[PDB]
Design a protein around this ligand. Structure first.
Ligand SMILES: CC(C)=CCC[N@H+](C)[C@H]1CC=C(C)CC1
Ligand SMILES: [Mg+2]
Ligand SMILES: [Mg+2]
Ligand SMILES: [Mg+2]
Lengths: 351, 353
């Protein structure tokens, strides 16, 4: 693991994007964290959900928390209810993103069942489509469509990932094709615009553009920050960076530089395009980026903590410019789960 | 200004060499046999009263679209059954027609999801017809492939939706162009429909198929953007194409964007070969037959007026010029077919019967 080269880039992106979540107080975050968590936990604890969603209780609990965090810290300008509902949806998606089961047998009649109104055979679809309306009520038709599509894309993405395939050497189009499939880009980007706060028809071009640009910023920033936790990992192995290596036949270092250039560039352009656009829009966008990074740095899932401390023992300036940031975030978003994530889902389920 | 005839010619010959454009066993009699089968089933379909009244399209554009599509399917899906060509012809005809509705889908998409989950017929007439017909397309494929078709068609709907705004992207929004081309390109639909379950085992060739979907998506749309460039060069009506959006969004010259499209296309082509040459023989055949057919179709269908940019250079001792003409003569040789030989009777005639 190029812990070395790891420092190098993360610092660039952070310094160039200039990570700094100012707006949004700790009391406010906690208030939201608990609202979302609470509604989601009660949801996932219902018997139906409990029996159709096959997940180890502890992974569910962990996933839920990582997601409530992500939504609350990035969808900073939406209502509490919207955060809660988005938290449920993104929790369903994450539970699948880490799973393993062939969907072939349950997808054989997908379309006929869909058109007929019969409950899907794949349990996941049964639960997600049943819950979906609670997510969709927060948006206009256009945005809704994007959510529906991206979630469908995501299902296929997980399907493909089950083959643990990084692409045929020479298949340069494979990597990004896959990252987009399992990235939920359009889902994320469109869910940033609740109809209660934005007029889908008045800001159509703004919203469309944001969906298109955010799709890449969002996934590439995650590929970058995750360049730690995913690796000697099992469900990983097939990451955008690792697929670049396999498919583009280049070194891990070269793929790394690539991701970085795309990321930095994507970042530069997000600003260039939205700075002068509608203020409300620029705020939702800026608040998302800062929150998204805050979440990456704060959530243990990405073990970003180490690469701060364990690089705190060595002055390489590239490992010190990194640390100037981490804390900068942990002091805003570092919150003990005992302050919001309670009681555990399992406890509500057996009640 | 002035069509980059030379640069164009070069790229076109190169594109063809890379894909190994060469003669095949698909005979003219065979094509005609297929052309008529597909056209006939489709025309009878589109001529039914229900279809006739929910699909708002000028009879002549329907007729023209149907023909352009039957041609595209028959000439590119060369290895699939007649029935599959027919059914794909109906589906791709629905898709081509939707770019005729200026009608805002907003009011008809408000309850899209609740109606979908409940099993109630969609409010947008297009969806009502397409989803009703879809099964006839889906029976030809396994679950995985089916899903790709469903998704891409949904993406396509949104693509048309966005295109109604005639928006080429905010200057600086470098991600807009391709984001849009992919949305309205039907890539995954095309790429996945190339593998009928009757002829391919979706599970045995999963990686082959997935990879083809991913690579074909770009080859297919970029080749079309390229061949369609001449017809839309001076066309003041056409305004938001991949190339024109590159200009607006990337803030570069039409010539520079043209370069970008060419490099991606050529490169996409090189890699299609590099990856599939050594793979399963039947897979490489479906792929190769698609590329050659797709190009044949572009050159042969008048929709792209490629005929003109020939009658302008069929006499020049230039290398590219001559190769181009030889490839065109090859195309015509096997693809130039009078509509009176298959496209009959007209849809309108079956409708009023
Ligand atoms: C201009 C036409 C009809 C086809 C060339 C490629 N398209 C961009 C795709 C989308 C629309 C369909 C129906 C098929 C493929
Ligand atoms: Mg994934
Ligand atoms: Mg993952
Ligand atoms: Mg990642």
């Amino acid at each position: 693991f190029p812990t070395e080269y790891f420092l190098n880039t993360t610092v660039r992106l952070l310094e160039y994007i200039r990570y700094r979540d100012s707006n949004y107080t700790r009391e406010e975050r906690i208030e939201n964290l608990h609202y979302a968590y609470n509604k989601a936990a009660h949801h996932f604890a219902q018997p139906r959900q409990q029996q159709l969603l096959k997940v180890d209780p502890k992974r569910l609990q962990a996933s839920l928390q990582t997601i409530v965090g992500m939504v609350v810290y990035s969808w900073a300008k939406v209502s509490k209810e919207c955060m809660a509902d988005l938290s449920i949806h993104y929790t369903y998606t994450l539970v699948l993103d880490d799973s393993k089961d062939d969907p072939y047998p349950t997808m054989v009649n997908y379309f006929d069942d869909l058109q007929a109104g019969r409950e899907q055979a794949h349990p996941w679809w049964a639960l997600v489509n049943e819950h979906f309306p609670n997510v969709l009520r927060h948006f206009g038709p256009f945005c809704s469509l994007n959510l529906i599509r991206s979630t469908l894309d995501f299902f296929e993405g997980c399907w493909i990932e089950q083959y643990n395939f990084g692409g045929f050497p020479g298949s340069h189009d494979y990597p990004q094709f896959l990252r987009r499939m399992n990235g939920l880009g359009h889902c994320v980007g469109a869910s940033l615009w609740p109809k209660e706060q934005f007029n889908e028809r008045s800001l159509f071009l703004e919203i469309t553009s944001a969906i298109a640009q955010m799709e890449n910023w969002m996934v590439w920033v995650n590929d970058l920050m995750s360049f730690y936790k995913e690796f000697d990992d099992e469900r990983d192995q097939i990451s955008l960076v690792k697929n670049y290596v396999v498919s583009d036949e280049i070194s891990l270092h070269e793929a790394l530089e690539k991701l970085t250039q795309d990321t930095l560039h994507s970042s530069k352009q997000m600003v260039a395009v939205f700075s002068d656009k509608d203020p409300q829009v620029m705020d939702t966008i800026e608040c998302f980026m800062h929150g998204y990074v805050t979440w990456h740095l704060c959530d243990r899932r990405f073990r970003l903590s180490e690469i701060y401390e364990k690089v705190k023992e060595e002055k390489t300036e590239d490992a010190q410019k990194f640390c100037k940031f981490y804390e900068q975030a942990a002091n805003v978003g570092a919150v003990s789960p005992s302050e919001w994530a309670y009681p555990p889902v399992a406890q509500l389920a057996n009640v």
